[PDB]
Design a protein around this ligand. Sequence first.
Ligand SMILES: [Mg+2]
Ligand SMILES: [Mg+2]
Ligand SMILES: [Mg+2]
Ligand SMILES: [Mg+2]
Ligand SMILES: [Mg+2]
Ligand SMILES: [Mg+2]
Ligand SMILES: [Mg+2]
Ligand SMILES: [Mg+2]
Ligand SMILES: [Mg+2]
Ligand SMILES: [Mg+2]
Ligand SMILES: [Mg+2]
Ligand SMILES: [Mg+2]
Ligand SMILES: [Mg+2]
Ligand SMILES: [Mg+2]
Ligand SMILES: [Mg+2]
Ligand SMILES: [Mg+2]
Ligand SMILES: [Mg+2]
Ligand SMILES: [Mg+2]
Ligand SMILES: [Mg+2]
Ligand SMILES: [Mg+2]
Lengths: 219, 130
Amino acid sequence: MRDLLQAGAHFGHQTRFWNPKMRQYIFGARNKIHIINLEHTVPALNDALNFANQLASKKNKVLFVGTKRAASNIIREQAQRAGQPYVDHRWLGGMLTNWKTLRQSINRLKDLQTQSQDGTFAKLTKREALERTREMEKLERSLGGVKNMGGLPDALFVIDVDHEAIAIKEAKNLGIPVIGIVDTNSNPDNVDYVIPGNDDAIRAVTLYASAMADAILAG
Amino acid sequence: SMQDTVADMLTRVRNAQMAKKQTVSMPSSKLKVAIANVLQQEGYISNVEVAQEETKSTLTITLKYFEGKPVIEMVKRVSRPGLRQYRGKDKLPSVKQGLGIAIVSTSKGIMTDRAARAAGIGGEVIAFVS
RNA sequence: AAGCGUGCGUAGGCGGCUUAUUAAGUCGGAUGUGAAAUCCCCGAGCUUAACUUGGGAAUUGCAUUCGAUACUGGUGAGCUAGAGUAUGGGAGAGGAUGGUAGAAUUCCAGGUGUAGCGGUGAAAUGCGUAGAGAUCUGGAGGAAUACCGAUGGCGAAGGCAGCCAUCUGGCCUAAUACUGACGCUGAGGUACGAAAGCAUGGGGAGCAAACAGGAUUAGAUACCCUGGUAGUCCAUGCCGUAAACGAUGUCUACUAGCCGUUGGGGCCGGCUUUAGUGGCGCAGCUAACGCGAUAAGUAGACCGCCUGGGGAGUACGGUCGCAAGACUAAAACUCAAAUGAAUUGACGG
Ligand SMILES: [Mg+2]
Ligand SMILES: [Mg+2]
Ligand SMILES: [Mg+2]
Ligand SMILES: [Mg+2]
Ligand SMILES: [Mg+2]
Ligand SMILES: [Mg+2]
Ligand SMILES: [Mg+2]
Ligand SMILES: [Mg+2]
Ligand SMILES: [Mg+2]
Ligand SMILES: [Mg+2]
Ligand SMILES: [Mg+2]
Ligand SMILES: [Mg+2]
Ligand SMILES: [Mg+2]
Ligand SMILES: [Mg+2]
Ligand SMILES: [Mg+2]
Ligand SMILES: [Mg+2]
Ligand SMILES: [Mg+2]
Ligand SMILES: [Mg+2]
Ligand SMILES: [Mg+2]
Ligand SMILES: [Mg+2]
């Protein structure tokens, strides 16, 4: 209630890039910037956290997908400290729709990482392994957060429903449940649990992620 | 200019349903209120209000939405000023095989199609609603 | 394929809100009539079926009479949200008339001065030793108005650009008052309507159909060059057509937003509100492209128009015209396509 107040979940984008489909979840606009009303915003963040908790309690997963290049550090931080799959660099178009094809790269990474410091690969050249290390690094910086997923996630948590539209469309296609933190400059089109609040602030994104994780820990 | 007012009201309601408005206002009239009361009794709108300002009245309709989509899926003016309908008790039309209504003006007031068929009369067909 | 070039308006169509009344439309009943046959349904006779036949149903009509008044119409009375009027301001290439300015071109006279100028892809025709071109001075004349200048403005459209006066049209915008549906659209009909053309009289600098010459070229009735007459200008009339286009008839209401700009109003450079004019874009719509509050969305009123391509917007008849022509407007015949939008290639001087 007041923890999001000192977090900057109120302030948002300027009052010229608003999406007119968010006018219910806004209160006013001071200094040429729309300010989201946190009052009814908390009553839906709590419902999203309850949904995430009950989804983690019935033995299901939830993909934390955030790649806005600002909350891409905190997403991995608060996810790997919660035992859940992550998406940090690129939303990798076709991750859910062509999940079978990306399985053929998740297996290439489950083979390459085991072929580095798990099988004692010796009796080889020092410069020859640099290419395979580059292959593994290019694969891991893209899929190292979905290696321990093994199947289609049951929920999703996005930090920018706008910047991650490909993921929200893949979810709305594959019948998955989405949860997003939608700001003023964003469409609440297919977010099953819309959570109005800042999508770019440091402390606000950290609060959203840490709260989602602490709700995941109800196990 | 503005000649059909029943159609103008039906168009206002249709357009407000298309844009997910929760309320639509319009200039009031005796026949508009008589049609809004039928739409409310059949459960197609929520509420009807008429506010007198000093001499001009204003009608205000509250709209219903059931699981996102609007309740009034189709509304059609049937008897235009350029062509009036005037059915008889035996030729009264059914809308969507009785899943929709037809507003009728009879000498016993404004009613639905099945009410007029039960009363054994029927005059001007105003609108199909579904 | 299909919005008249644009208005104005006649007949007509359609028209705000409240109320009283009427009962013409509309609705309901009754009563006549709606021939039989046929059709339809039950069932009856042919050994069955065709076929024949009993009874109904139907004949949705019209007339008379009685009833009902929601809606439409009539009639009376009201009302002010449409339409209009009065009064202060504002912007404007709106129009008509008459003056006037400056630049430049052309020509003429003179001065200086001497051998080229001009023109092209290259040239030549052409102009120059009778003195060109260049430069200076004076003059004559006609036409158009650099800069400003702007998806700026005004106009019904066509259109409208130096400056000034005179006469004049509309629009915007604020208040207060007034009238009280006086409206919208309109077949016929009328008014205006680019350029070219035509008539009569002027004028004629530049440009320039026709034309002449020089080139180019296989040829070159062209493109390029040098000239050049109608015409372009004015007065007064005709003509009545244009890719007269937003290829989008007029009027009304409603439907996310964002970014400009023009003319105003309001409030604190900014916010809002109006009338225009632009760029995006949600919904919706669309064959697609696209449109998207300046709709091609959602609806309503009236009008115009289309119905395969060609023959053909042609013939004939007629109306109009000085004529050129315009307008109205076919058929025989012929073909099995013609067309729109997008896609993949290939090609492009
Ligand atoms: Mg066409
Ligand atoms: Mg037109
Ligand atoms: Mg009339
Ligand atoms: Mg009338
Ligand atoms: Mg009667
Ligand atoms: Mg008979
Ligand atoms: Mg009256
Ligand atoms: Mg002058
Ligand atoms: Mg009065
Ligand atoms: Mg008219
Ligand atoms: Mg006409
Ligand atoms: Mg020439
Ligand atoms: Mg024409
Ligand atoms: Mg046309
Ligand atoms: Mg504007
Ligand atoms: Mg303004
Ligand atoms: Mg657009
Ligand atoms: Mg339209
Ligand atoms: Mg269309
Ligand atoms: Mg002809």
